[PDB]
């Protein structure tokens, strides 16, 4: 049937929940956002200069066994911020754990 | 739960900037049409619909407009949620389909200011907290309203004045949404201060895509949407108050 995916909310001014990227599910906490088409999650292979990826969760790709490597770089500009990487392919879960 | 099999997605490197630092989420999950996903990259929902993982197309979210409420909100994939509105749906055509995009026939002010006065184009913006309208727009109803700048089109209100403040009305398909003053502030705290920030932001966005007004979090809380990729249609109920 319908998936509940449930939210927290943070202040009124975040709300996000939980999905799992890989196999087994490396879990993350997104905004579902319907401003934008792109999923992105934080990567293992962050810059050191990328301060923002030390207090959030890492994607390792080395640890599922259903990802696939892409690597074209992306930029994306949303109104309240910027950022850049590459991509990858892998079974998205939601939730996390289900 | 669903698993969307061959996803295709960014592991970000560089976050210039400070805004992602102290954000509560890992990433961002986006929503809208295929017309604005950044390389072409067919989008998590689109995926899902084509592996028919669920069997009507569409998607809804309830926000809950108290910080400390439990849940926080929900989304529903492939359906609507019952327990989180009240009385029934109303619908919008999608005017462009990029963004989920909407005729938004008018803004006002209780007390007499009308905004997109002809009508004009919005769009329905899960991941933007605030309602955001031109930047000479919403200075004009900030003036109504008693409103004080901030920074970054952000304005604020005495929180002693909010319970005395005019309603806003914004319509959609002919119908009045109403928005009560307590719907259109947020409380807003940092180092042990408590304040009130308007709900309204100004914003000019450029075209060709804009100008656009946003339906943000401030309206979605209010007014539980579902998001229709089927008959590409947005719709509002009254959400559980
Ligand atoms: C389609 C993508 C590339 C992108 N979308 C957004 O920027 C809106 C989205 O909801 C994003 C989701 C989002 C993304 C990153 C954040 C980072 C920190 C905090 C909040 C964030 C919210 N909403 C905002 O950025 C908040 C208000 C912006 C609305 C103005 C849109 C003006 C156009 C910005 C330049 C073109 N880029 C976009 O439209
Ligand atoms: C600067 C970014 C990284 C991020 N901005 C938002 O979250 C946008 C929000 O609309 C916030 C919500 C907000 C607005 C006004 C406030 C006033 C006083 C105290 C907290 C406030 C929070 N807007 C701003 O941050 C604009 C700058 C406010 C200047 C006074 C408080 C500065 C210290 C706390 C800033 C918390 N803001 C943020 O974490
Ligand atoms: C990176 O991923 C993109 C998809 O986001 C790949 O391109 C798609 O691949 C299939 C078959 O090769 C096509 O039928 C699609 O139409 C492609 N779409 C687009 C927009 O590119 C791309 O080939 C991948 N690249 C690498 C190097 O792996
Ligand atoms: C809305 O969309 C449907 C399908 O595109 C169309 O048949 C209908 O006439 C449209 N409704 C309005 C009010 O324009």
Known sequence: ?98 | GVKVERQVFGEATKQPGITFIAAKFDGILGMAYPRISVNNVLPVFDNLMQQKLVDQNIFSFYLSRDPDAQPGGELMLGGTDSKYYKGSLSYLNVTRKAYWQVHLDQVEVASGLTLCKEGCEAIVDTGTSLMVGPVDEVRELQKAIGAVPLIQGEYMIPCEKVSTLPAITLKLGGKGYKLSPEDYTLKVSQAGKTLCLSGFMGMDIPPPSGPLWILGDVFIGRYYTVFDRDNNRVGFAEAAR
């Open chain 1, 1 to 98: 049937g319908p998936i509940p995916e449930v939210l927290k909310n943070y202040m009124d001014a975040q709300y996000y929940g939980e999905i799992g990227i890989g196999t087994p599910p490396q879990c993350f906490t997104v905004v579902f956002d319907t401003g934008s088409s792109n999923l992105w999650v934080p990567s293992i292979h962050c810059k050191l200069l990328d301060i923002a990826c030390w207090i959030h969760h890492k994607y390792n790709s080395d640890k599922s066994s259903t990802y696939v490597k892409n690597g074209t770089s992306f930029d994306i500009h949303y109104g309240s911020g910027s950022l850049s990487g590459y991509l990858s392919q892998d079974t998205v879960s939601v939730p996390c754990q289900s």
